[PDB]
Amino acid sequence: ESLESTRRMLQLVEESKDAGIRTLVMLDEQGEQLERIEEGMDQINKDMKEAEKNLTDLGK
Amino acid sequence: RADQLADESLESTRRMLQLVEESKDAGIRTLVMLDEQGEQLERIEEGMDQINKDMKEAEKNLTDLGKFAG
Amino acid sequence: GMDTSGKQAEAMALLAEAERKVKNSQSFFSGLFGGSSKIEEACEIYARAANMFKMAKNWSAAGNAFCQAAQLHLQLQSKHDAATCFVDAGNAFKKADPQEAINCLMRAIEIYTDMGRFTIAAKHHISIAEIYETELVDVEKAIAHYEQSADYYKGEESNSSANKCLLKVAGYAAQLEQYQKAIDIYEQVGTSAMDSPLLKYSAKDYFFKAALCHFCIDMLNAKLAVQKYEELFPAFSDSRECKLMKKLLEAHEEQNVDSYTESVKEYDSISRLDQWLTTMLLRIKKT
Amino acid sequence: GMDTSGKQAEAMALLAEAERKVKNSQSFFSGLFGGSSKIEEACEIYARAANMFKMAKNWSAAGNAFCQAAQLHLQLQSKHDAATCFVDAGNAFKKADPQEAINCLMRAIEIYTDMGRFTIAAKHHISIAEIYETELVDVEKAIAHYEQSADYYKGEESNSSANKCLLKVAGYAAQLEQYQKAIDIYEQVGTSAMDSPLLKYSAKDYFFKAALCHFCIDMLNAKLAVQKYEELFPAFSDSRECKLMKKLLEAHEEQNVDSYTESVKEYDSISRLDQWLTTMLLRIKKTIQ
Amino acid sequence: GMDTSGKQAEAMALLAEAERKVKNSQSFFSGLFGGSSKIEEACEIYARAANMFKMAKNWSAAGNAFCQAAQLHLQLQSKHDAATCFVDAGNAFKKADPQEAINCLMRAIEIYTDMGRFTIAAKHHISIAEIYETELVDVEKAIAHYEQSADYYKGEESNSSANKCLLKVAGYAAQLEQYQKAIDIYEQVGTSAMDSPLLKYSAKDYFFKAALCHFCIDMLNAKLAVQKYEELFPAFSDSRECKLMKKLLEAHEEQNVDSYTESVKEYDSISRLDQWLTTMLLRIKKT
Amino acid sequence: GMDTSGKQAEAMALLAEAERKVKNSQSFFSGLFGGSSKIEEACEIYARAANMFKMAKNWSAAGNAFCQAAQLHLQLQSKHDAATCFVDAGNAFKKADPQEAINCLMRAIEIYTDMGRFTIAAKHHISIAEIYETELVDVEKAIAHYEQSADYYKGEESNSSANKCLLKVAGYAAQLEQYQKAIDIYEQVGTSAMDSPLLKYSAKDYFFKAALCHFCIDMLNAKLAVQKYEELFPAFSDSRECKLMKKLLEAHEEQNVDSYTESVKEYDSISRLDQWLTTMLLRIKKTIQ
Amino acid sequence: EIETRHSEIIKLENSIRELHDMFMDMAMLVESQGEMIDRIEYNVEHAVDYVERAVSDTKKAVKYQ
């Protein structure tokens, strides 16, 4: 009974490992993406601040 | 020979129990963590789409007003 | 529901007073020449009639409305809006009839590549490749689309997306029995993944698949290739994959079907196999 | 609370100012012209007052102020701020009295679907559903709301949310509704998951639920369903659940309560049963005869 | 080094030109009435001066400059910029001297809540609370700020955000020999933890703590609480924790101090405890 | 390919067009004085030429055009756009010429930090260090860049990024530089994680590294620091690393290289190496006498 | 001894199964987050392009004045 129990243990452990590796790959992709989105956000923020302030100053 | 059997078996139980507890706290902690960024990124969803709608409508109305003036 | 079918009827009527707007373009804009905003609101009613169709689950009508709105709106102005409308039409056509979705998506691809936005263009390329795969049977066009999208991704250092695209391409080429490209791609991706501590655990599978692909062509050089893999990565032989490959190749030296048959059955006894590996082994081990 | 006492005092002051501002509105619609700006300032002060009410713990007052400001704002040929204020009123009414929150949310939904944003409409639909089932004792409207949410999600290609919504609605219907729909949705979701590498290691549970649903009606059709499932899905055969169902059906064929009871007890010993699976097992047992 | 020295040199220079700016700008406003552009220019001079002060590694003066810019700007009848300047000054004052950072953060929270935005206000409240906790010992202010933040979060339906603050408040209240608040918060979070598809596994732990704290009062009440929880959570007995509580109860029943301590030591050996649990266990053992 | 040759042909045509456009703009400023629209449109032509040129797959002239356009744009008192173009030109040159890419990236870093953005400056510093070390063989400048990035991160309480940068700096220093800085950084980072939310069981390894560094210095410092950590961190008492270190210490005490060799072999058999511990262990073994 | 080993094997079985469930939930939540971050990327890029061309057109119109 212990023998088949350990067979089950092996199968479950290797399966969890195999799936987790892809979990990590996915999380790495998420992290990779976030910096690009952050850069775009900061760029638009700067552009909007400068553009709107210049237009308001020109209005005077 | 039963001496080394008992030694390795105690070592096995200790390591397995300890290692299982470490895996368990790790996982539970991380799972509890995930929800927070879940709803945070939800709320950026909403804030961003509000920004988009407002700026689009503002710009179109302003182009129409500029055409009216000209 | 049904009353929303009646309101899709009056939404064909909405497209009909958009037809009256193009009748204005025909005769009445002579006195309403400044009514470019009139054309804009005609396009808006076009788009909203298309949206009512979409909600009404009339995919062909919604796609027709989207395409017409895009064509009317792309008056050499507001190009990005036309591209959005074209991609919306392509998404609507995805279900039912997807063929013209391909042409509209290609037009959007051209517009974006004209603008330079390569992530959007490459994801659209992946979209057309996958719709080809799942709907049509052509694979070569999918391969070309994947190559193009991977090139665009690698242009901006987006390495992981290009790596997965090339992995899929190498798999398909192996299915298409062009093993040089497959081995090149698999070796490249494995030697890249081993570089960083985040992916070093994956290298084993890539190396195993590349070893199988190389073994397919030349038995004799397979031993040299596996030795090169081992010496390059000291932690490869320990993996069950290297031991199994060594068992198979050494058994092939002697004409004993059993040896490798029970080897593979034992390996499958610990885990199930996929169609790709099983088919590849069945094809190769026949001789 | 002194904080809350002064908070309510300033809230009453702002209410008096808002009453004076609606007086301004009625004097500028019938007495003056261009009051649109004046009633816009009235809306601004109304929103300030409503937010301060929300801070003041007076949820009903905050929601009423939000509803009044929104309905006044609708008259100014503007729709999006109307939607925002309707959603805010619904959120305020979520607690305390949620019934009118349902109505106001429905108004926001019809506005949105008139505009064209569907994912927002769908998320609001699921919110309406969840509030209805958690606070309102009624489930058919729950089924309908989940159906509409799943339709909206799957129409926009957002597969995952539609899948989970369909799973939940089908599972709930199985408890109190004819199991044919349970079978259909469970089989559909299981089949969809088989190909995908995500749920292909969990669709066994969906197949098990479908098998139990088949059994609760009849045995022969349950046998046919399970054999077809394992034929289509070979890796289901080795599943402990397959052995479980085999022993249960063999015992039921013989009409031996003791064997079935001890077998389910042994299965419970490992892992754990659930309120739903326990109810299903008891229901099928009760008609053993 | 040299970079910082030069930065501070032109920093003193820029502050000289900034004081000249403000003085001659008020003079020009009095004598010519040029409007308010000069005041805005002085504000931007203050902003860049504070920025380059921070570059120069002088946080106190940078925060002072930020506060001056904020007050001059709000004097110019504008809020969001003044709020940004105040929060920047608070961040600069966080290190070195943080006391005035408290006041400026209070002002920022006040203006924010006056406007009507909540989440940033609660974030600032928790920041002030952690400042008090880390740098001071007046835990009462930390409790008040955590409670206010939790109230905000729960009011805005952010149940998860409120839960962390409530747990911290319960922990600190239990630390200061008050158990009723701890008992209430712990049982409330445990009961809200029943139906969570995810947090259910941990739903046990909170309850455990409650029993321990509930055992600080008497013996019978602890038994009643633990049996009530076990009835409410049928699987609670499954964990070793119920076994441990029953062992503690029986050992303390017959003044079995030794077996109590050996059971605690074995529990520590299998898995180590923290300062909080060890302190509570020792306090219980005192009687 | 036709696409390439056409892309380069029209790029040369557009570059000539932009050159004549800028010369005619210099002429027209005095001739007609139209303002600055001419220069702006010339910069737009330059940007379009440069982007389709990098799209033609040719890089160096693309980055050169980006640099020229950014220079002419900054000539008109526009900074952020010119700095973004500088960053893009540096990225393009990354694969063409390291020196010009480094120059443009440093320009972008200085101008950004002048603006007031640190995180972008730190990111650019890290990218500069990565490109500098990956292909060019040198560390000290990379160490300085990593230290600056960590400093900027800590300036905005970005604990994780600064922690990683400091850990990498300490590792590189221990590899080549002296050990005191490695000791300090490793010990500080390790002890700054005693109460980590997820990493409660992490600092151990760091301490071991510190121990090794201490052991690399002298036996007495090794043992004294080992004890200090033994009292400071109780869990390290029961770490496998503690027993391995103690065994190595007692073996090296008696000058029996065979015991050390068998101990390290046994450790390697249980656990795989890291290629960084092996070098330090070899260096330790080199001084057994 | 052997009875303790039976207790250990039972506990290990339980822990492994519940670990499996947790991991599956992790994967589901993560893939959902990935999808919806992707949609946000799309929308943000579109907003960037639209607003850039917006400012360009507005400044050109001001120049015309």
From Swiss-Prot, chain A:
GO terms for cellular component: actin cytoskeleton; axon; axonal growth cone; BLOC-1 complex; cell cortex; cytoplasm; cytoskeleton; endosome. It is found in: Cytoplasm, Perinuclear region; Cell membrane; Synapse, Synaptosome; Photoreceptor inner segment. Keywords: Cell membrane, Coiled coil, Cytoplasm, Lipoprotein, Membrane, Palmitate, Phosphoprotein, Repeat, Synapse, Synaptosome. Palmitoylated. GO terms for molecular function: calcium-dependent protein binding; lipid binding; myosin binding; protein domain specific binding; SNAP receptor activity; SNARE binding; syntaxin-1 binding; transmembrane transporter binding. Residues 1-52 are annotated as: Interaction with CENPF. Its main location: cytoplasm. Residues 1-58 form the t-SNARE coiled-coil homology domain. The keyword Cytoplasm applies. Disulfide bonds: none annotated. GO terms for biological process: associative learning; axonogenesis; calcium ion-regulated exocytosis of neurotransmitter; endosomal transport; exocytosis; locomotory behavior; long-term memory; long-term synaptic potentiation. Part of the SNARE core complex containing SNAP25, VAMP2 and STX1A;this complex constitutes the basic catalytic machinery of the complex neurotransmitter release apparatus. Recruited to the SNARE complex following binding of the SNARE complex component STX1A to STXBP1. This complex binds CPLX1. Found in a complex containing SYT1, SV2B and syntaxin-1. Found in a ternary complex with STX1A and VAMP8. Interacts with HSC70 and with SYT9, forming a complex with DNAJC5. The interaction with SYT9 is inhibited in presence of calcium. Isoform 1 and isoform 2 interact with BLOC1S6. Interacts with CENPF. Belongs to the SNAP-25 family. This is Synaptosomal-associated protein 25. The lineage of its organism: Eukaryota, Metazoa, Chordata, Craniata, Vertebrata. The gene is Snap25.
UniProtKB/Swiss-Prot annotation, chains C, E:
It is a peripheral membrane protein. GO terms for molecular function: protein-containing complex binding; SNARE binding; soluble NSF attachment protein activity; syntaxin binding. InterPro entries: NSF_attach, TPR-like_helical_dom_sf. One of its GO terms (biological process) is synaptic vesicle priming. GO terms for cellular component: glutamatergic synapse; neuromuscular junction; postsynapse; presynapse; presynaptic active zone membrane; synaptobrevin 2-SNAP-25-syntaxin-1a complex; terminal bouton. Belongs to the SNAP family. This is Alpha-soluble NSF attachment protein. It comes from Rattus norvegicus (Rat). The gene is Napa.
Curated annotation (Swiss-Prot), chain G:
Signal peptide: none annotated. It is found in: Cytoplasmic vesicle, Secretory vesicle, Synaptic vesicle membrane; Cell membrane; Synapse, Synaptosome. Expressed predominantly in cerebral cortex, hippocampus, cerebellum, adrenal medulla and retina with weak expression detected in non-neuronal tissues. The record marks 60-61 as: (Microbial infection) Cleavage. Phosphorylated by CK2. (Microbial infection) Targeted and hydrolyzed by C.botulinum neurotoxin type C (BoNT/C), which hydrolyzes the 253-Lys-|-Ala-254 bond. Cleavage inhibits neurotransmitter release. There is a cross-link at residues 59-60, 63 (Glycyl lysine isopeptide (Lys-Gly) (interchain with G-Cter in SUMO)). Residues 1-61 form the t-SNARE coiled-coil homology domain. Belongs to the syntaxin family. Plays an essential role in hormone and neurotransmitter calcium-dependent exocytosis and endocytosis. Part of the SNARE (Soluble NSF Attachment Receptor) complex composed of SNAP25, STX1A and VAMP2 which mediates the fusion of synaptic vesicles with the presynaptic plasma membrane. STX1A and SNAP25 are localized on the plasma membrane while VAMP2 resides in synaptic vesicles. The pairing of the three SNAREs from the N-terminal SNARE motifs to the C-terminal anchors leads to the formation of the SNARE complex, which brings membranes into close proximity and results in final fusion. This is Syntaxin-1A. It comes from Rattus norvegicus (Rat). The gene is Stx1a. The chain holds residues 194 to 258 of 288 of the full protein.
